[PDB]
Write a protein that binds this ligand. Structure first.
Ligand SMILES: C[C@@H]1CCN[C@@H]1C(=O)NCCCC[C@H](N)C(=O)OP(=O)(O)OC[C@H]1O[C@@H](n2cnc3c(N)ncnc32)[C@H](O)[C@@H]1O
Ligand SMILES: C[C@@H]1CCN[C@@H]1C(=O)NCCCC[C@H](N)C(=O)OP(=O)(O)OC[C@H]1O[C@@H](n2cnc3c(N)ncnc32)[C@H](O)[C@@H]1O
Lengths: 260, 260
């Protein structure tokens, strides 16, 4: 008669946010299976784009159009970058590779290096961004992924104000159609941050520099910047209950169960 | 009087393929520094796109337009996938992470899984592709990167012929403006391959299935497929002498030295 907790977990795997007893499990499951197959058939017939890849392209266009240079830097980075980031906590979260390398947990160290290098070539202000994989060993699963995709944009030189930072953040999220509020906060690496929140979900940490860490990276100018999780953004935008629906995954494609 | 080998290495870092004694080092270096700064100033003023990101978007459009579903699957994969790929050589090249995981050296295992899963939902033939980071510990540096980007497209069910495989390969490279020849070859994992060559550079390995490995992955249909290195393609297309100019890098941006 009543659904078991296991049967309910199974149907919840198959349930999309848009979907609207005493029908048996097998018929509810069969109905959901049929709707999800059709969802995939529709993607496949019409658009064929992955949400994560698509979101990356749309964000890329946004920042290129606003004068930010698109970076593609290494994902596998020297372990020394972590120490030079002032990380020794987040330190338990580092995936190490070989004796000397690790999977980057953030984009900041490589973007510090690009900021310094490009200051020799490019006019003030220097505007750059990267979108790409980042990795953190994580105990949670509801808002945390071990493998995720971060956007980090930043500017250095003139115009590096808190007002300009907030304005970019605001134009960005309004462009994406994502509701937010900007709250003051802090963390170990940076300060002193602004946190961009969706209800109780952190979409972004943002910082108005300078900060004392800059000197370690050969940086001696004002800067502003923010990092956003693309899977968090997708999660809010598609109203996914679990962030795993927005991840690189063999179990979900565009938030649709692939176990059909 | 004559340039030292070190000075010549330095100028070669600064030399682009398009650039056309007895001028001293310092003046040749100063001239090249000036041209490279201007190259970066021009990217930054006009397009602002990274070559690797841009090539990915263009390839994505190509395959989406031809009816292939865009996949984004994990980069960090179970070590068991390597063994189930029949790899135990390429095995010394695997970057391991934790006891149970590794950085994927190829896209094939996750695409095998997607082929099987999607066969329950999608009409025949099933056409899919992924573009993304792959990792192999490598002794060479001239045509090999430890961190690279592979494209793998594939089809399963009807139309999985050698002729159709070659036609897609041909339309693809002609679209990209890349000269090639298709040669028969073989490797340990697959067969029996077709190798897509640019002079002596391998652009792609391609396979007409079925093969006995399929059964390990729950696959019992004809398939065709190919994997291309995006950095190899960029290398040919931009006439870069070294493939490091085409990599995710803090030393090169669009093949331009960032050490200016
Ligand atoms: C780049 C310049 C030069 C130096 N630094 C500058 C800069 O711009 N700094 C300003 C702040 C940038 C971001 C900072 N480095 C950072 O890593 O912030 P976090 O808050 O730790 O990560 C940013 C976002 O990534 C997402 N994220 C985090 N961990 C996860 C997870 N495990 N699963 C899924 N999503 C997650 C989440 O949305 C989070 O708000
Ligand atoms: C996906 C379906 C389901 C199962 N398999 C199917 C399939 O489509 N198989 C057909 C063949 C696909 C490719 C095969 N798995 C593979 O890994 O081929 P490789 O030749 O080892 O790699 C393909 C290309 O990646 C590039 N590449 C390689 N190593 C490097 C390097 N270290 N640095 C830079 N570039 C490199 C290089 O261009 C090479 O030609």
């Amino acid at each position: 008669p009543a659904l078991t907790k296991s049967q309910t977990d199974r149907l919840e795997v198959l349930l999309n946010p848009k979907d609207e007893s005493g029908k048996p499990f097998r018929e509810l499951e069969s109905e959901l299976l049929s709707r999800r197959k059709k969802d995939l058939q529709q993607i496949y017939a019409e658009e064929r784009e992955n949400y994560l890849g698509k979101l990356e392209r749309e964000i890329t266009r946004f920042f290129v159009d606003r004068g930010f240079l698109e970076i593609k830097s290494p994902i596998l980075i020297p372990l020394e970058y972590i120490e030079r980031m002032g990380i020794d906590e987040l330190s338990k979260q580092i995936f190490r590779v070989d004796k000397n390398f690790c999977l980057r947990p953030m984009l900041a160290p490589n973007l510090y290096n690009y900021l310094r290098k490009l200051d020799r070539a490019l006019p003030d202000p220097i505007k750059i961004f990267e979108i790409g994989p980042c990795y953190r060993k994580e105990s949670d699963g509801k808002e945390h992924l071990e493998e995720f995709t971060m956007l980090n944009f930043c500017q250095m030189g003139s115009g590096c104000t808190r007002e300009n930072l907030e304005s970019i953040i605001t134009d960005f999220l309004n462009h994406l159609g994502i509701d937010f509020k900007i709250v003051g906060d802090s963390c170990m690496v940076y300060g002193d941050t602004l946190d961009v929140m969706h209800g109780d979900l952190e979409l972004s940490s943002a910082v108005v520099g300078p900060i004392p860490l800059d000197r370690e990276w050969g940086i001696d100018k004002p800067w502003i910047g923010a990092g956003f999780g693309l899977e968090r953004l997708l999660k809010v935008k598609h109203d996914f209950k679990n962030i795993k629906r927005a991840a690189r995954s063999e179990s979900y494609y565009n938030g649709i169960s692939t176990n059909l």
